[model samples]
Target: HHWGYGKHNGPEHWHKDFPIAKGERQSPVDIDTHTAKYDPSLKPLSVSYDQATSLRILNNGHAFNVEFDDSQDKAVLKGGPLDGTYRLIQFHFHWGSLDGQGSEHTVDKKKYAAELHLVHWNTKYGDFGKAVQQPDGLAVLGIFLKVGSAKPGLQKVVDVLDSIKTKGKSADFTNFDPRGLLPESLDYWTYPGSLTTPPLLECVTWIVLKEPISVSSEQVLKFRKLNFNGEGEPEELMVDNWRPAQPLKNRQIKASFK
Candidate 1:
């Protein structure tokens, strides 16, 4: 099955192209907090960012990932009820066409319009890629985006969306602080999960924020305008680029308080 987005090309078809997609651990299920039990022992961790950090934007067309050079300032998750230090490695996003929604996690069987993932790793264990292979090596912070009133917080990143609009195109983005994009509260829901993508590795520790951020409809349209087409070629606009919701497999999701 090749699991992706769109009517004809959805998550069910993804595994056909990538044989590893048959794994049981997929992401973006419709989660309802009312039915799930809460764990008070879990606390909100303060994530600190370094000023000297740099961002590398790769225009892969279908998707883009910003790799943070953690050699200097690593994201330190401290003062939490939990007992572990996580280092920031990279962050990325998943979106859909103007008409379709593209959130990886679902709540009450409803998929959000879009989703952003800030991927981190537990330095106490191993590197990011290596940690991905382990059940508890990865920590992902998820944020849901809704189209409504204008959101000034997104201006910083959206301003550059048009610069690297083509596949394989890249540019330098410096002094960009990702914390600005965070919602007002850090209170989140924690759960043991796997990567949303194929290989479906079940080594992720998920931290999904309870509060969602808002963005303008225009901003959402900008993502649809992007295309994987190379420069000097006819525009092959990328309308939808998201994966459908996956099975929860009876996993438990926990919530944390400050």
Candidate 2:
């Protein structure tokens, strides 16, 4: 509760509670495709998700996430910069109040309407808590969202948003497959970066897709309907929840395709 996307507790002040906030590999960077190197060695991503593994969707004060059952490898991500399989744990979104500037990762200085993050943990790490401390222990797949055609796959998650209007509210959401949320092209830019949120651990292997998925403008407005406060507390709509892009530092962004 010490950090938020506000001026008092926002990213700029996170260093007081989380020193790694200033770490070199911090995430949500501006992807300059012109400067990014193409690495032929990078393989196509292999993402396999089980429909039944999706458990529930919740508003965790910062963002809404669809949690998954990661007890087994039913939903997992492999290849494309991963040495071993990474189990899907949860997926969340970041967006703005308006249509223009919502996504955390920008392309050639261009921002999207929103962004989705599929979080995973390495099978070798045993669990997420331990995995956060190790480099290459986590893999996050980021997909940009542009305002256009309605993405039917996202409607399922949106339909349940009213049930979780406040922070900490969650409802049963199963038999859903996350694969449907992906763009047609798996081509992406791979980099070494940290979580875009608090703790800002530098253990994530970021796979940001070059192609953006489509989402209706109305759907993003529905996301704004959710609140950051708990039930009966002051109502604060969750918007502009995305952290601004951090410095690229000396890191190299590698593209999967030439």
Candidate 3:
């Protein structure tokens, strides 16, 4: 049940079907290439799961938004992982309209099947809603999702996708550990930028991971199968859910390793 092009093709069309689509951040675009002259100092930190902190899940139909209790069991990235103790705010994903390409980070203009964003904020500054205004206040970890024969680690997420099937609907997800979704490697590319979506604020510190997690074609389809269309007309399947790329605006993209 995927929505095809017509009056429902691009980002503009989504607004009428899902009003939040107009307000939310759309992703998957190309960023100008830049070389890192020096390697950034990143310290490795331990990220443990805290069960006491309730896990919250939001099924927006387009994707799932997960929030954990960073106030309790926090995630720490050592080295130059930003200069403060950042709290985990929320994590979400972006995908394409179809099964082949949906990710935001492109490799030489080539798009991946999907992308995952784990957003955190510098609590030293404030909560996400407030911290997003200050430089170095937001840290977003990006992971590319390629379609292939391998199983998508995303099953952990899709398994619960059904829990949130309607717009503005959410559920309490208990005993769920987000760490299971992290790719094997921690190596990444860091940069200074703003939110990829509208109101496109410039307070984000982007950390795009070098390695990607594998998922099957079917898994990719599940994401594309989601619809934002209200409960009447046919389900408006989400295809090509990515936003266009933004300009670098003379920003520096630094990598953890030189």
Candidate 4:
């Protein structure tokens, strides 16, 4: 509640409330691919999001999140610096209100039109709530979204945006496999960082994808229309909800591919 993306109370003032905002390993850092170290030891990402794990979609006022039921290990993320299985929990997106890059994380000084995050939590942590505080408790796979052809798989999500156009609104969403939203190559840059949102928990091991998925300009602009609040609210549109790139102080990014 004490944070937002406003000129007066945006990411710049987030540290005033969440002290970890300026921590050594904050997220949404710029990744210069050429400078990244290739680590053959880094295993390939094993992402198996259940075709039915997707439970529902909700407008959380900040981002549109697809909630998943992690009751069983039906959908899990393992390998790629993970020691144990981390169950798939939820996924969300960040976008720009205008025709520019809206992604939280950038690559080599360039930004994507949007970004998709598939979040998972360590099994040892029991649940996501507790995992947010532990150093190695969470793992988030970041996929950059560029403006281009229509992403066919994302249409399943786009068709329902009209139903939950405002905050607190939710609708049924199922059988959405996130695997289709990824690039052909699994190459990525891995590092430790805090959550890009409020509370800025320093528990995430970021695995950002190298290649980007395509989305049409029309689809990208649709997200900008969704108001941050429910009906009868002040019409605070939900765009540019992404946090700016944080300082990458002495942080090294490991690559899973050359």
Candidate 5:
């Protein structure tokens, strides 16, 4: 069987596939509230996402990744714990199997209904694959989603869920601005972490927003309808795709605002 979020092939079994699973800088770490320091040097996040660059949405056996065209500087992210321009490549979502704690990153041991990751790669590295090798190659902007009022931005994505119900299935998702998914405030906790997936490369600079975006049960249930297998393959429900929180190892998490 392939590596997946299941009892047999879930996160705990990743170390057998990738040696870096237990690395010191593993991601999805808990953000301790009291210990996070407010650093003034941290700049406000600059997010510029052009809807024209939005290419398609695909169910890649894990979560829904809204792919983008990273060939140009049309959509870029910088100005926050970054050394160079981090171009927007894709954005994805992680959620629970049902309506339980499914978020990869937790706040004070509290889990949200879901998590959004806007993955960006450093310009110097040129591509995401190469970028993941460097220490400052990747910058993932994490946004938490909680069940409350329905978000208009979410509806656009949910509307396409049926089109991509099976893995490897996708539809043209054009003119979708990724910024519309963010919360009102950009205040966040910054720290050095890694990809929360198979490779588990410890090269990501995590920028997790302190404020959560509102979502509704109606919309979240739509995600459950997706399957992790291709149309020809046997169907497997895609849920609880988030990895468990890794050890912090005394790594300090910086706050952008007091």
Candidate 6:
């Protein structure tokens, strides 16, 4: 029926509904850092955010997402691997049941405790609906999350989890600045990939930062408190809510630095 992290509906079973799950440009590929070619032509990535654009927090049965107001150019991402500016749409996280492993894409096959995906749509394509179909329609910024010192930026998000603890639940989360969540260095690895979730669209230009932001183990555990099922349904904890690394196939990963 529905796809989930369980054995019956996990990544291995996704190809049944979305054949592109086996496509050439599938995402969350393992990065062999040494194999990543440094591209001098790539520009420094640029991102500007407005605290006023944040709208609310939502538990969409998959992962919790903080959506933004994209009607204006309040927050935008440009440069790097993108040909045009992309508007901030929503940001979400994927985590594992344990602190050792959770992230989607791994470097040198090393898994981080969690991952954050800031999803953006190419503004040239009009809106998210139309942009989602094109090959270069989306740009997803992936930041690895490791368990360590508590990040103040993350504390703000973790403090609100209990409010949206079940599937389909959402609460107003205004005036939040997403810029604090980013790592100091914007140097990243660029590659062509798909959305890690179902429908598994192959439209994203992945910009995975080289450095990660830290969050305490306590903060990571707070995410699991969210229920995969809605209210009144059998309780199913939202743990290990991340897809494994897919094959790289014929694609190449490029690095911004040596």
TM-score of each: 0.87, 0.98, 0.79, 0.96, 0.97, 0.98
The parts of candidate 1 lying over 4 Å away from their true place are 1-10, 17-20, 50-52, 78-82, 232-234
* Best of the two (1, 5) by TM-score: 5
Clashing pairs in 4: 51-175
The parts of candidate 3 lying over 4 Å away from their true place are 1-54, 76-81, 149-153
User: Residue-wise lDDT of candidate 3 within 1-258, one digit each (tens)?
Assistant: 232233544545544544534332323335434554346466543344343343888866556688777664365432445676666667888888765567877755777888888877777765677787787777787888887765544576677666565556678876666676677787776667666554456677677777788778777766665566544547666566566554444555566655
Instruction: State the lDDT of candidate 4 residue by residue for 34-137, as single tens digits.
Output: 88899888998888765437899999878899988888887888899778888888899999976576999988888888999988999898999999989999
Candidate 4 local accuracy as lDDT?
0.87
Decreasing TM-score order of the candidates: 6, 2, 5, 4, 1, 3
**Alpha carbon deviation, residue 69, candidate 3 (Å):** 2.1
Tens digit per residue, CA lDDT, model 2, 66-111: 9999999989999998899999999999999889989999999999
State the lDDT of candidate 6 residue by residue for 136-254, as single tens digits.
99999999999889989888899999998899999998888999899999999999999999989999999999999999989998998999999999989998888999999999899
Compared with the true structure, what per-residue lDDT tens digits does model 1 show for residues 1-258?
Answer: 234354565667667676545655556566677765678777666778754264777777557677687654356555343456677777777876653477878776666678888887777666777777777777788898888876786675677878888888877877677877688888888777777776567777778888888888888888777775778888867655666666667677776753
- Candidate 5, residues 158-250: lDDT per residue as tens digits? 999999999888899998887779899988999999999988999999999999999999988888788988898888888899998999996
Q: Of the candidates numbered 2 and 5, which has the greater lDDT value? A: 2
Instruction: Please report, in order, the local distance difference test score of every candidate based on alpha carbons.
Output: 0.71, 0.93, 0.64, 0.87, 0.90, 0.92
| Backbone clashes in model 5 | 0
TM-score-superior candidate, 4 or 6: 6
Tell me the lDDT of candidate 1. 0.71
